[PDB]
Amino acid sequence: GSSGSSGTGEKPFKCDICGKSFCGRSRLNRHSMVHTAEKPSGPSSG
């Protein structure tokens, strides 16, 4: 496995946290939520 994303350039969408692309926002939108998936119960990183 290596850097791909080959085909008619990149996707019509892109992330803001990791820049992840998604052929369809319907997916990306949700992905942008995984970046803020952290509970208080667990510790944090300095």
Residues lying near Zn ion in the complex (CB under 5 A) are found at 15, 17-18, 20
Nearer to Zn ion, 30 or 45 (CB): 30
Q: How far is the CB of 25 from Zn ion (least distance, A)?
A: 13
Tell me the C-alpha distance between 1 and 28, whole Å. Answer: 22
Amino acid making up residue 43? P
Q: How far is the CB of 17 from Zn ion (least distance, A)?
A: 4
Torsion angle, CA of 35/26/24/39, rounded to 10 degrees?
10
Q: How far is the CB of 13 from Zn ion (least distance, A)?
A: 11
